[PDB]
Design an enzyme around this catalytic site. Structure first.
Site, short mmCIF file in Angstrom:
data_model
loop_
_atom_site.label_atom_id
_atom_site.label_comp_id
_atom_site.label_asym_id
_atom_site.label_seq_id
_atom_site.Cartn_x
_atom_site.Cartn_y
_atom_site.Cartn_z
CG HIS A 33 -0.32 0.27 2.59
ND1 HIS A 33 0.08 -0.62 3.44
CD2 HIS A 33 0.00 1.50 3.13
CE1 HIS A 33 0.63 -0.03 4.47
NE2 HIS A 33 0.58 1.25 4.28
CG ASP A 93 0.25 -0.88 17.54
OD1 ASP A 93 0.65 -1.95 17.11
OD2 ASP A 93 -0.67 -0.21 17.08
N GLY A 120 4.11 5.49 9.46
CA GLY A 120 5.54 5.78 9.19
C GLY A 120 6.37 4.52 9.32
CB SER A 160 3.41 1.46 6.79
OG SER A 160 2.78 2.33 7.72
N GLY A 161 5.49 -1.09 6.16
CA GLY A 161 6.53 -1.60 5.21
C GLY A 161 7.73 -2.16 5.92
C1 LIG Z 1 2.60 5.54 3.08
C2 LIG Z 1 1.20 5.14 2.57
C3 LIG Z 1 0.85 5.97 1.30
C4 LIG Z 1 -0.51 5.50 0.72
C5 LIG Z 1 -1.65 5.58 1.81
C6 LIG Z 1 -1.25 4.95 3.23
C7 LIG Z 1 0.18 5.39 3.70
O1 LIG Z 1 0.64 4.70 4.87
C8 LIG Z 1 -0.06 4.92 6.05
C9 LIG Z 1 -0.92 5.99 6.27
C10 LIG Z 1 -1.58 6.11 7.48
C11 LIG Z 1 -1.40 5.17 8.49
C12 LIG Z 1 -0.54 4.07 8.32
C13 LIG Z 1 -0.37 3.11 9.31
N1 LIG Z 1 -0.97 3.19 10.49
C14 LIG Z 1 -0.52 2.06 11.00
C15 LIG Z 1 -0.83 1.59 12.25
C16 LIG Z 1 -0.27 0.35 12.65
C17 LIG Z 1 -0.58 -0.17 13.90
N2 LIG Z 1 -1.65 0.25 14.53
N3 LIG Z 1 0.22 -1.06 14.43
C18 LIG Z 1 0.60 -0.33 11.74
F1 LIG Z 1 1.20 -1.53 12.05
C19 LIG Z 1 0.89 0.19 10.48
C20 LIG Z 1 0.30 1.38 10.17
N4 LIG Z 1 0.38 2.07 9.10
C21 LIG Z 1 0.12 3.98 7.08
O2 LIG Z 1 0.99 2.92 6.87
#
Ligand SMILES: C[C@@H]1CCCC[C@H]1Oc1cccc(-c2nc3cc(C(N)=[NH2+])c(F)cc3[nH]2)c1[O-]
Lengths: 151, 254, 96
Positions: free
Chosen positions: B41, B186, B190, B192-193
Site C-alpha cells: 500500500h 504498537d 511511518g 508501515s513496510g
Molecule cells: C505511506 C502510505 C501511502 C498511501 C496511503 C497509506 C500510507 O501509509 C499509512 C498511512 C496512514 C497510516 C498508516 C499506518 N498506520 C498504522 C498503524 C499500525 C498499527 N496500529 N500497528 C501499523 F502496524 C501500520 C500502520 N500504518 C500507514 O501505513
C-alpha cells in the site's frame, strides 16, 4: 475438526496432566504449553488421547503460571488449517503449580540436579501440618487447595 | 513506534527507509544487497516513480555520518491479488538499481523457509518491529530509529480479544496480529513496510511486515502484520526472474 | 492400569498411592501418566525444530535431516550451522 473443550489441569505433588474432551473421531491433537512471555513448546504430538502429561515442563519453574492449548487436526491431514491458515485450537485455564497443585518428607515430581525435591524443599515455610490440634498438610498462604486430605 | 526504545545504531542493520522526493515514504527490510521487502500500500499513490530511493545504514535522520547508502529503486513488484486501498496481500518486493555494500551497518535479514517459519518461528513469542514512524498516534515521527518487542497472537486469540468495529478489515490468512491491547505499545504510521523480525537460535528472520491496525496502540486492538511465510515461494521465484521492463510490476500470486 | 497394586508406572517408574489415584515418578527419559512416552522418540521437526539450529526436514522411516540457510554450512554435529560468508544474513556484526 472440532475443538477440544473442558481443558482441565489435574495436578498432585506437581505431577501435572491436562485433560480435555472430546474423544476424537478421526482427528488427532497436539498440545503447546508456555508461560506468558515464553515461547510455546509442543507435547503429545498428534495423539488420540485426551490428556497430556506436562510435569516435565511445569516443574522447571513451578512459580510460573502456564497456559496451554490443544490443536485438533483431521487424522490423515495434520497440515489442515482453517480460514486463517492456522490449526483449530482452544486454550486451557492458567495454572500456577506452586499455588494450585494438590498435596497428599514426601517427594514431589520437581527435580533438581537429576534428583527429586520434597514438599518442604519446595514449600519451605509456607507448609505446616495439622494433628487435630490426624495429619493434613496445609499451605495457609494459598487461595485454593490450601489443605490436603488426611491419612 | 509507540512505547519502543531507540534501536542502538547498527542493531537493526536490515532496516530500510524509502523516500519519495526526499520525503519519508515507508520502512522496508533488506533480504539481500539488491532486494528489499516492504508493504504494497505504500505505493498506492506514487506517480514520481523515478524519485523513489532506499537508504540503508540510516539511524539518525537529522545528521549525516559515514554509514548511509542510497540507491534508487529500479522495480517494485506487488502481488496480483493486492487491491489498492486494502490491507490484504500487503507485500512489495523492490529491486534496487545497484546493490548496497554490506558493512556492520548494512546486513540483510534472512528470509526463512516456509515450514520453518510456520512451524517454529511462528511460536517464538516476541519479535522486534522498528521504524521512524509516529511515537504516539497522530504524534511526532522519530529521528533516531525506534524498535519495539511485541508478542505474537494466533488469530483466534486476536479476533477474541479485539473490540468489534472501526475501519478494521478482517484478519486473513495473509496477516497475523502481534502487540498489546492496553494501548501502551504498537507500531504506527511511518513504520508501515518495515520489519517484524524473529530471533531463533542466533539468527534473525523476517516473519512479518508492519501493515495496519485501528489507530496505533488503540485499546482493545493489536497491530496487524503481513504473514511473510505465505509469500516466500513468490519472493524467491521473483528474485530469480529476469528484469522485465516496468517500475511497478504486479506479479502472479500464488 | 489400576492404582499401584497393578504396577501402572511403566519404563521403571515408581507409583505413589493417593486418594485412589496414584502418581508415577518416571525416569529422566520417560514421561506420561504411566511413564509411557519415551522422550527419546519424538525427533520430528514440529518438536523444537527437531533440534536443528536452522532448517529441518523429516524423512520417511529415516531420521530427520537438519539444513542451513544460504551463507551457512551444516557442522559435524549435524544440527548447527556456521556462516561461510562475511555478512551472513540475520547476524548483527557489532554484537558478534
Ligand atoms: C505511506 C502510505 C501511502 C498511501 C496511503 C497509506 C500510507 O501509509 C499509512 C498511512 C496512514 C497510516 C498508516 C499506518 N498506520 C498504522 C498503524 C499500525 C498499527 N496500529 N500497528 C501499523 F502496524 C501500520 C500502520 N500504518 C500507514 O501505513
Amino acid at each position: 475438526t472440532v475443538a477440544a473443550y473442558n481443558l482441565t489441569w489435574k495436578s498432585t505433588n506437581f505431577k501435572t496432566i491436562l485433560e480435555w474432551e472430546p474423544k476424537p473421531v478421526n482427528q488427532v491433537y497436539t498440545v503447546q504449553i508456555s508461560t506468558k512471555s515464553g515461547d510455546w513448546k509442543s507435547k503429545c504430538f498428534y495423539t488420540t488421547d485426551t490428556e497430556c502429561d506436562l510435569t516435565d515442563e511445569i516443574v522447571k519453574d513451578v512459580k510460573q503460571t502456564y497456559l496451554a492449548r490443544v490443536f485438533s487436526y483431521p487424522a490423515g491431514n495434520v497440515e489442515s488449517t482453517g480460514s486463517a491458515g492456522e490449526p483449530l485450537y482452544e486454550n486451557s485455564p492458567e495454572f500456577t503449580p506452586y499455588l494450585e497443585t494438590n498435596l497428599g518428607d514426601e517427594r514431589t515430581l520437581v527435580r533438581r540436579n537429576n534428583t527429586f525435591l520434597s514438599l518442604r524443599d519446595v514449600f519451605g515455610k509456607d507448609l505446616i501440618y495439622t494433628l487435630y490440634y490426624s495429619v493434613q498438610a496445609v499451605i495457609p498462604s494459598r487461595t485454593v487447595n490450601r489443605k490436603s486430605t488426611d491419612s | 513506534i509507540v512505547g519502543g526504545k531507540v534501536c542502538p545504531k547498527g542493531e537493526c542493520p536490515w532496516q530500510v527507509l524509502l523516500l519519495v522526493n526526499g520525503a519519508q515514504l515507508c520502512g522496508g527490510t533488506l533480504i539481500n544487497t539488491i532486494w528489499v521487502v516492504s508493504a504494497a500500500h505504500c505505493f498506492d499513490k506514487i506517480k514520481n516513480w523515478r524519485n523513489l530511493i532506499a537508504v540503508l545504514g540510516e539511524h539518525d535522520l537529522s545528521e549525516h555520518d559515514g554509514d548511509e547508502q542510497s540507491r534508487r529503486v529500479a522495480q517494485v513488484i506487488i502481488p496480483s491479488t493486492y487491491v489498492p486501498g486494502t490491507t490484504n496481500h500487503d507485500i512489495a518486493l523492490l529491486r534496487l538499481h545497484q546493490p548496497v555494500v554490506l558493512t556492520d551497518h548494512v546486513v540483510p535479514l534472512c528470509l526463512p523457509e516456509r515450514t520453518f517459519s510456520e512451524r517454529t518461528l511462528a511460536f517464538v513469542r516476541f519479535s522486534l518491529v522498528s521504524g521512524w514512524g509516529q511515537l504516539l498516534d497522530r504524534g511526532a515521527t522519530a529521528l533516531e530509529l525506534m524498535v519495539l518487542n511485541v508478542p505474537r497472537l494466533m488469530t483466534q486469540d486476536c479476533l477474541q480479544q479485539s473490540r468489534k468495529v472501526g475501519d478494521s478489515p478482517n484478519i486473513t490468512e495473509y496477516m497475523f496480529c502481534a502487540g498489546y491491547s492496553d494501548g501502551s505499545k504498537d507500531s504506527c504510521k511511518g513504520d508501515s513496510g518495515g520489519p517484524h523480525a524473529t530471533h531463533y537460535r542466533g539468527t534473525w528472520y523476517l516473519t512479518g511486515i508492519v501493515s495496519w491496525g485501528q489507530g496505533c496502540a488503540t485499546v482493545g486492538h493489536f497491530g496487524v502484520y503481513t504473514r511473510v511465510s505465505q509469500y516466500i515461494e513468490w519472493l524467491q521465484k521473483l528474485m530469480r526472474s529476469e528484469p522485465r521492463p516496468g517500475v511497478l510490476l504486479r506479479a502472479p500470486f500464488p | 492400569g489400576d492404582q499401584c497394586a497393578s504396577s501402572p508406572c511403566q519404563n521403571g517408574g515408581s507409583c505413589k498411592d493417593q486418594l485412589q489415584s496414584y502418581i508415577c515418578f518416571c525416569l529422566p527419559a520417560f514421561e506420561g501418566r504411566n511413564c509411557e512416552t519415551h522422550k527419546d522418540d519424538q525427533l520430528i521437526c514440529v518438536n523444537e525444530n527437531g533440534g536443528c539450529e536452522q532448517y529441518c526436514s523429516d524423512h520417511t522411516g529415516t531420521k530427520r535431516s537438519c539444513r542451513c540457510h544460504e551463507g551457512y554450512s551444516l557442522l559435524a554435529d549435524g544440527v548447527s550451522c556456521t556462516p561461510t560468508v562475511e555478512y551472513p544474513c540475520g547476524k548483527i556484526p557489532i554484537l558478534e
